[PDB]
């Protein structure tokens, strides 16, 4: 799954094949 630990989503985000954040830049 989204390996980007910089992501702070909750059970619901489709961060499976559409990540768009960097290391210290999460704007989901
Ligand atoms: Cd994110
Ligand atoms: Cd997400
Ligand atoms: Cd992500």
Curated annotation (Swiss-Prot):
Segment forming the signal sequence: none
Stretches assigned to coiled coil: none
Induction summary: By heavy metals.
UniProt function note: Metallothioneins have a high content of cysteine residues that bind various heavy metals.
Family: Belongs to the metallothionein superfamily. Type 4 family.
Protein name according to UniProt: Metallothionein-A
Native species: Strongylocentrotus purpuratus (Purple sea urchin)
Complete-protein stretch covered: 37 to 64 of 64
